[PDB]
């Protein structure tokens, strides 16, 4: 299984497990934060990351084979996708994240 | 495992264990101090160091192999990295620190 | 292990054990005295010495090999170091101290 | 072990044991007397001797070998030392003292 580690922001060092399938990361201010509590905490498929500006919401898709990891950067009325690699800084908006195997600490 | 020892500041002689991965050191005044209590004390990945001026926040990254230690000096909108050596004074801003093996007292 | 003995001041004859590593001596008036109580009394790495004038803060560094003893005299924005010898008067500011082995009374 | 015996003053005949190392004798008026009670009575390394004028503070240093006895006469910003002999009147300021072995009464 894979883990998203924040490399910057006020939550630098936070690590969020990923579930097979798609996981949403809402990145922004308190308006999004307080509005994100409307969905249950069942096997988390979404997370909120505070970021004072330049935040961009994104989704990380992990296939059932776990041989490819796609990151969907969400934009107005659309999304853009890219393939990402493990153990390397990934910049989404002003947020810097790293996706690692659970067994390979960063 | 490695330990950060402060060589100056009002906490001179304080020693902070490092965990595999990244550890944040917030260095500054009371605004940062009282605002740093918003995150839990779970296996500490962050520390606050008081310093009346010239403080610079930084991160110490310890690889899982423990064969290289990187120090990321945080700057506005960016960070600068450098490799550091054990048992030698390291200057970050006006702060002077030393990174040592747990078994090698300074 | 080594012991610092004061040879002058109002605490003349006081003896302070040294721990492997660095020990801070704050030397000055009551402003420093009452402000020095903000850190815990865990294995003391700091001490306060009253001195009506000419006091200078310093650190005594004892290596893990105990084959060299360095005294860091603290100055504004910097420190100066010197190697010191056992069983001899050492002048730091107006303070006169002596560093002796625990087994060799002065 | 050695003993200091006062040969004059209002405490004439008082005998004060000496400990290996340095012992302080504060000699003066009531200002010094009432200010001398700020240190604990642990293995005494200091004593107060009343003397209406000409009092001079001094220290008696007894080496661990007990083969030499040094008397440090304290002066402003400095001290002067001299070697003293057992069983003979020693004048410090207007105070007259005698240092004797514990087994040799005066």
Residue numbers in the entry:
A (entry chain X), B (entry chain A), C (entry chain B), D (entry chain C): 14 to 119
The authors write:
The injectisome can be divided into three major regions: the inner- (IM) and outer-membrane (OM) spanning basal body with associated export apparatus and ATPase components, an extracellular needle, and a terminating pore inserted into the host cell membrane called the translocon. The major structural scaffold of the basal body is comprised largely of three proteins that arrange into a series of highly oligomerized, concentric rings: two intimately associated proteins localized to the IM - PrgK/EscJ/MxiJ and PrgH/EscD/MxiG, and a third protein belonging to the secretin family of OM proteins, InvG/EscC/MxiD (Salmonella enterica serovar Typhimurium SPI-1, Enteropathogenic Escherichia coli (EPEC) LEE and Shigella dysenteriae nomenclature, respectively). In summary, we report the crystal structures for the cytoplasmic and periplasmic domains of PrgH and InvG, two of the main basal body components of the prototypical Salmonella SPI-1 injectisome.
For both the cytoplasmic and periplasmic domains of PrgH, we applied a 24-mer oligomerization constraint, according to the established stoichiometry. For the cytoplasmic domain of PrgH, we observed that mutation of two leucine residues to alanine or an electronegative glutamate (Leu20 and Leu87) abrogates secretion, while a more conservative mutation to tyrosine has no effect (bottom). Protein sequence alignment of the PrgH orthologues indeed illustrates that the conserved residues involved in phosphopeptide binding in FHA domains are poorly conserved. To validate this, we engineered mutations of the PrgH residues corresponding to the proposed phosphothreonine interacting residues in MxiG - Arg35, Gln42 and Asp65 - to alanine. These mutations have no effect on in vivo secretion assays. We therefore conclude that the PrgH cytoplasmic domain is unlikely to interact with pThr-modified proteins. We note however that the FHA phosphopeptide interacting loops in our PrgH structure are accessible on the cytoplasmic face of the ring model, suggesting a potential interface for protein-protein interactions. Indeed, deletion of this domain results in the formation of secretion incompetent immature basal body assemblies lacking needles suggesting a role in the correct assembly/coordination of the inner-membrane export apparatus.
